Amino acid sequence: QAFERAKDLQAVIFDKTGTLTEGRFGVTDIVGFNHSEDELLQIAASLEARSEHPIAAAIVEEAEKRGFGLTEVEEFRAIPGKGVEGIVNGRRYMVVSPGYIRELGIKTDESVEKLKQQGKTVVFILKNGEVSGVIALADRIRPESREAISKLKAIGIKCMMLTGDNRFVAKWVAEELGLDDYFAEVLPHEKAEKVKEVQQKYVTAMVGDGVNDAPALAQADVGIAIGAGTDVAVETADIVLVRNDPRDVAAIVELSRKTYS
Binding residues, by number, are 16-17, 163-164, 191, 209, 213
Which residues are identified as catalytic? 15
- C-alpha 10/C-alpha 245 separation (Å) is 20
What was the experiment behind these coordinates? X-ray
CB-side neighbour CA atoms (13 Å) of 192: 10
| Under 8 Å between Cβ of 135 and 44 | yes
Q: Which residues contact 197 (CB under 8 A, 6 or more apart)?
A: none
- C-alpha 46/C-alpha 97 separation (Å) is 17
Neighbour count for residue 195 (Cβ, 10 Å): 24
| Under 8 Å between Cβ of 221 and 206 | no
Residue 158's nearest CA partner among 183, 131, 123 is: 183
Q: Which domains does the chain have, with CATH numbers?
A: 1-23+142-261 (3.40.50.1000), 24-141 (3.40.1110.10)
Q: Which residues contact 95 (CB under 8 A, 6 or more apart)?
A: 44, 47, 48, 56, 59, 83, 84, 85, 123, 124, 125, 126
What is the maximum alpha-carbon separation in the chain?
Answer: 73
| Under 8 Å between Cβ of 139 and 17 | yes
Binding residues for Mg(2+), by number, are 209, 213
Q: What is the resolution of this structure in A?
A: 1.6
